[PDB]
Amino acid sequence: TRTIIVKFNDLEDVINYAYHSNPITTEFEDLLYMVDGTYYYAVYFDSHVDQEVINDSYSQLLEFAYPTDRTEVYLNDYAKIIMSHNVTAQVRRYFPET
């Protein structure tokens, strides 16, 4: 694959990820889909990134978020894209932490 998707049960968990994640330094783009009040985070890597660096990054995500319960195909149709290309930076800009 080139794409990974994880489900965040609430905005607080996304803010947790935005502050406390230390992601593997990798070339990728990200998107924040939302439906039904649930947040879905998706990352699309460059074609040159190997599948195992992707699996590593994906497993680092699972520390904070669940595996997705909706396919990419479904989300690209039904879900509102809230933010794009630099989700974590945008979150950390708009949301402070205590």
Binding site: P67, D69, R70, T71, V73, N76, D77
Partner: protein, 133 residues
Amino acid sequence: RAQRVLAHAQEEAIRLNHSNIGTEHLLLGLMKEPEGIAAKVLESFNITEDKVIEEVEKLIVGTLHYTPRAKKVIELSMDEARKLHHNFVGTEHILLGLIRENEGVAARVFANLDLNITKARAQVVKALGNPEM
């Protein structure tokens, strides 16, 4: 819901000067909404808009109406909403309609493009379902 797919069907029929709006125009409609589950699924079977146009053109005045079978396809898609998506019938339910109502022009466009109909149903169901089994 992407009701726009019907507007595409009607506009394509008008563009081709047909006296009727039929299951071929529904199918061309689905290819005009590439956001949709249906467009992705068909593209996953390598059914694609240009080939659909060529098949429809080779396969076949005033105001227009749906053919008596196209009407039934629409109503039947609102029966595929017994997957409990309720009022939000969508491109997936239209395509499941055409897959159940296996007659008329669309069913032959599928046969000409070699699509396995039961595999297409399974593919849609798998796209809708939770990928955690």
